């Protein structure tokens, strides 16, 4: 089990939904959540997730994204 | 804040990802999670989510779905 936290440019509900649905569509994801005071942290938990590829998809579709944490759960 | 639990026909990783991404795409959703021993419970948390419409979208795209719980968080 792996937990990944990505800071994402997502300044409205529509853009939060686009990013959440992108992360949720990666095979092996069990959980996706938006957190933080600014609602700009995407938290993804699953098995067999490549963090580098996930951040690259989010950067491509949301414009800006940065990997903040990877952690075994 | 509202938490919704839907039992969904999702017997593989690909079909779990399709259902998760469908729930995540609804505006106002903050969290989506797959739970249960059989990995067949979709847990959705957010604001302003219509549970009846959510279950109807999941039924249409995954084949079978049933609302199990709605709860204020």
From Swiss-Prot, chains A, B:
Family, similarity comment: Belongs to the disease resistance NB-LRR family.
Name of this protein: Disease resistance protein RGA5
Whole-protein residues included: 997 to 1069 of 1116
HMA-like domain as annotated region, ranges: 4-73
Oligomeric and partner information: Forms homodimer or heterodimer with RGA4 through its coiled coil (CC) domain. Interacts with AVR1-Pia and AVR-CO39 through its C-terminal part containing the HMA-like domain.
Tissue: Expressed in leaves.
Purpose of the protein: Disease resistance (R) protein that recognizes the AVR-Pia and AVR1-CO39 effector avirulence proteins from M.oryzae. Resistance proteins guard the plant against pathogens that contain an appropriate avirulence protein via an indirect interaction with this avirulence protein. That triggers a defense system including the hypersensitive response, which restricts the pathogen growth. Contribution of RGA4 is required to recognize the effector avirulence proteins AVR-Pia and AVR1-CO39 from M.oryzae. Acts as a repressor of the RGA4-mediated cell death activation.
Cystine residue pairs: none
Domain notes: The HMA-like (RATX1) domain is responsible for the specific recognition of AVR effectors.
Compartments, as annotated in UniProt: Cytoplasm
Domain HMA per the UniProt entry, residue ranges: 1-70
Highest taxon, organism lineage: Eukaryota
């Amino acid at each position: 089990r792996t937990k990944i936290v990505v800071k994402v440019h997502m300044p409205c509900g529509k853009s939060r939904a686009k990013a959440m649905a992108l992360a949720a569509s990666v095979n092996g994801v069990d959980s996706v959540e938006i957190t933080g005071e600014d609602k700009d942290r995407l938290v993804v938990v699953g098995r067999g997730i490549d963090p580098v590829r996930l951040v690259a998809l989010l950067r491509e579709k949301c414009g800006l994204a940065e990997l903040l944490m990877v952690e075994l759960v």
